[PDB]
Design a protein around this ligand. Sequence first.
Ligand code: PLP
Ligand code: PLP
Lengths: 396, 396
Amino acid sequence: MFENITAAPADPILGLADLFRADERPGKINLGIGVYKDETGKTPVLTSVKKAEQYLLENETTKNYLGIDGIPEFGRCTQELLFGKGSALINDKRARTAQTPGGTGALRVAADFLAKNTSVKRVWVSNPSWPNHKSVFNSAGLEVREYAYYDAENHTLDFDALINSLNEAQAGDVVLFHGCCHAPTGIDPTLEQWQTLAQLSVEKGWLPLFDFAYQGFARGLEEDAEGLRAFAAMHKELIVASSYSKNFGLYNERVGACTLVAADSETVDRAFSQMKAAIRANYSNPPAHGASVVATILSNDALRAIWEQELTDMRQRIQRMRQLFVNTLQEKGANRDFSFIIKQNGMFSFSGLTKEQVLRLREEFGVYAVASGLVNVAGMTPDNMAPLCEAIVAVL
Amino acid sequence: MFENITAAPADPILGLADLFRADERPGKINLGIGVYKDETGKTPVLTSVKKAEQYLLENETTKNYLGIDGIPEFGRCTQELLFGKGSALINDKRARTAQTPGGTGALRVAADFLAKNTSVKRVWVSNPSWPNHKSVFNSAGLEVREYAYYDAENHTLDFDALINSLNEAQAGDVVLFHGCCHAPTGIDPTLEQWQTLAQLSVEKGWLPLFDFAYQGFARGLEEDAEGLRAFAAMHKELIVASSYSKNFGLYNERVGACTLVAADSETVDRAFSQMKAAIRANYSNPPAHGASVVATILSNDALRAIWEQELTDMRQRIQRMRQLFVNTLQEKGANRDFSFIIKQNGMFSFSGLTKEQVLRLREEFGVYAVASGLVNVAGMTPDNMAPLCEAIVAVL
Ligand SMILES: *Cc1c(COP(=O)(O)O)cnc(C)c1O
Ligand SMILES: *Cc1c(COP(=O)(O)O)cnc(C)c1O
């Protein structure tokens, strides 16, 4: 069967990474990275997870299969993180969490459950969005449509265009929202905008699916959950796909969760059984190690205190690199109003550079960025900031 | 959307497990377990993996994402295990391995790749087979058909019925073969039968998909690969889905692999790119920990020597429990010819018990078995053997 199979393309970041390692120049900077890096250009394993891992090694007596939905405590812990510690959704037991292989894994079991157990045909995604979204929904045969979001020339959330695009969505469509640190723009709705979106959502009958991969990177753990909780307060049903890859630095251990909320415990158990059938037909039951680390940190006060502090250190490093970028550019002098960088949250932002400007940034300076001018702020350090900003001033 | 979603059923083993833990009787025996247990009724973590895990904890500096296909050394190591250390398929680089979440994960990415990149509509599965097979192929929309395999009244491989069922398969269909320790019968083709199957396979144009979950449990690592290598010697293309859950006791770490073989390196790279697109749209990239443990054991002589010995200890425990079962039954006296138990390989066999006999075995004695009379030999110990066999003699 494989003699005229056509080749699949290479995803942008992969391609850039190759071109970067093959770049003989020494002062090269890779801003198209997709992962967090600290002030020394490394993605370390957190001290809290090394300690949780030491512990698991001394206490694990079996590697026997976890249940389809993973470890119960992991479920407890992401529900409290997501919905707040004394939430009505938790006390009325309207929610069920399945441990998945990362946030992508969570999005695919949601897509498979939806495609086979309900009537969704369409999923609405922001323009732009995190790239892999369309492939995940399309593999499940659920059609993807885009709503407007980003105002290119103004570097802002075009809320009017947003609510006006979404009026073409009809009752029974899924609308996907990024919970905080919108990938790739870094522009998030304000809390009032989240509440008018929540109200509009119930009124037109949308099924909200939240992709929550950056909790803790915009303001803090509870602050970042504000919009999701504005929705959960008004919706009988919702799905939230969360990831622990970035806030726990556990990228390759594949730890995420898919949480189903329904009107009552009875209907969420019935729906959840079909979500478990979907997992059973995909990877059977989930990888214990990364989720086990997350569950022992979150349930222990000492370990969780260390983790929270390590996460604010990440958040604050990103926040001073956004500051430093604007300042060193303004100091190196050109016609900047890169001020919008300061108002965006998370590791990503569109710089406003044109694709031929990023092309001579690679060719002439060795600064590597995605052709759309997307830049990962975590690739900037105090040491590479002045070479970076000089290169940007030279191509402007 | 979830208000009239119907409930999914509960998979047999799960149901039996519940009924077993809720059984107040103390001398209860659960033979419907699906996992290996040692002479003390436990599924321990192997000493070789504890040592590999100690090592990973002291040497890992990052949890950054693995490539879509996982860690390269893991790929090296399963290809040599599968095809033999100096294989032509390895030197001509006709094979590509993707690290997957367990053997089930490997079967689903194969199904997704096949469904979307080639013309298979059908997958042939043995009657009977490991239950989850049909759900995996059906989730990918690939129709499943059954070929005859087991001779119920004779407790044997009905080879004639097998080749005669498979003549209804046409060129371009997938035929799934269990590499060794056929689940659930424990009946395997002889090497000559594997070679006539291999010859028939090329002649009618079947695409062979091997499910290899028990390498090392029938005779030894190389012996068990004999049939797959009989096929690989004659086929231009084949897919093998392997699991390390049972032979490394790494069930919940989800470590398996999907290996693609094509006629030349050029066509396997092109086909493999589309298999990577399939993984990218499912869980993105694979869980590092279990695969990392497997790669450091298999590449280190000292650790691999300890592992091989731990695996033969498992294989031999199962082999003396089959012996002991037949002997204690023959000693407890009824009209046994349970001799076929000795000739079956792996942890599973059909006992020949009727469903009402297994029903009074639970009700009256607390011996728990799957309603089809399937029994897991690893649930027998020298200590529970005489209570078990007495109960079986009483219901015969
Ligand atoms: C990182 C990310 C994911 C994927 O999470 P993984 O755990 O890495 O698979 C999903 N959605 C968004 C917006 C993300 O940034
Ligand atoms: C155990 C098994 C699998 C599944 O392997 P996992 O790694 O547990 O998902 C697949 N096929 C057969 C025949 C098996 O026995």
